[model samples]
Target: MGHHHHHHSHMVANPPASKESIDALPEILVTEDHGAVGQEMCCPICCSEYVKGDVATELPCHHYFHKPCVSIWLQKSGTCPVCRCMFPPPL
Candidate 1:
């Protein structure tokens, strides 16, 4: 597993939700069921375990990510790392 360190960077402010409903985030396969306990999953990009307390962002594709990591990735390319779903176009 690889690790990335984020320092001296700026985070883009997330846009205000125009509606109270967000029903289109991507869903991941739950292969290992822990039954009322959380499971650890690696990030498909770097194959690293998501660190605790990391600020996660949800994509319309229903995937969640560490905000800094995904922001940097989307700046370079578009798509979910695991499912290859195209991210929603900018509103």
Candidate 2:
């Protein structure tokens, strides 16, 4: 039920942050602290898992995920996936 809904509902009628605006978020590299926590060991949006020296991007939740997953994910919304926090573009 929730699986398909995850791709719809909020996606209907209106689109997301668009390409250029969403691409502005900072992307970083994964170092030593990646898999230390269970919550973000891997990006739920994409199949890829954490690996040392992997390219990752930081979301507004003070958390991080795969650059591939997060870049497109943020294109859907500028906030942490499933997190209550949100990033309203600009100030």
Candidate 3:
């Protein structure tokens, strides 16, 4: 019989945040003319402009996105689409 050496597997370099963590992110309600005041702010995902009464989710990086837009995006990635900031895990 022959002997073989084995090594322990390493953990993932980066793991995605849980849904509870994502949901814990700060969010605010916005009107069409709320963000940036004079400047225009658009959802990176939908490409359309933010309108009145749109719910905005704020990432730790300080970027804002439509509630629905970000919720769906977070399902795939636990990072901010604009700055690539990883979502923090629950304390």
Best by lDDT: 3
Worst lDDT 10-window in candidate 2: 7-16
- TM-score of candidate 1 on Cα atoms, chains taken together: 0.47
**Which regions of candidate 1 are displaced past 4 Å?**
1-40, 89-91
Question: Order of candidates by TM-score, top first?
Answer: 3, 2, 1
The C-alpha TM-scores of every prediction are: 0.47, 0.55, 0.66
Q: Write the per-residue lDDT of candidate 2 for residues 5-89, one digit (tens) a residue.
A: 5544444342345556545656667667666333557667765567677777665556667767766766676566666345443
Root mean square deviation (Cα) for candidate 2: 4.7
Candidate 3 regions with alpha-carbon error over 4 angstroms? 1-14, 35-40, 89-91
Question: Highest TM-score among the candidates is held by which one?
Answer: 3
Which scores greater on lDDT, model 2 or model 3? 3
Q: For candidate 1, lDDT tens digit of each residue in 1-49?
A: 4387764333553233222222233323333341111324666555666
Candidate 3 lDDT score relative to the true structure: 0.65
